[PDB]
């Protein structure tokens, strides 16, 4: 019981870590990890959604 519970919890937390770090790495590689440029928002270059 101890082995199973401890290692399930650790595996789940490390999966969450994968999600976080992968997202951050991809965003940093793309170049907009620091935030939106407040001048050239990609959403503004799209037509209004109706």
């Amino acid at each position: 019981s101890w082995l199973a519970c401890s290692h399930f919890c650790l595996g789940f937390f490390f999966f969450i870590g994968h999600l976080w770090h992968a997202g951050r790495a991809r965003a940093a590689a793309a170049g907009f990890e620091k935030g939106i440029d407040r001048f050239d928002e990609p959403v503004l270059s799209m037509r209004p959604l109706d």
Partner: peptide
């Protein structure tokens, strides 16, 4: 979230 340029971790 990656398409629009916003930060990625809303999934987290």
């Amino acid at each position: 979230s990656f398409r629009l340029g916003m930060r990625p971790w809303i999934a987290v």
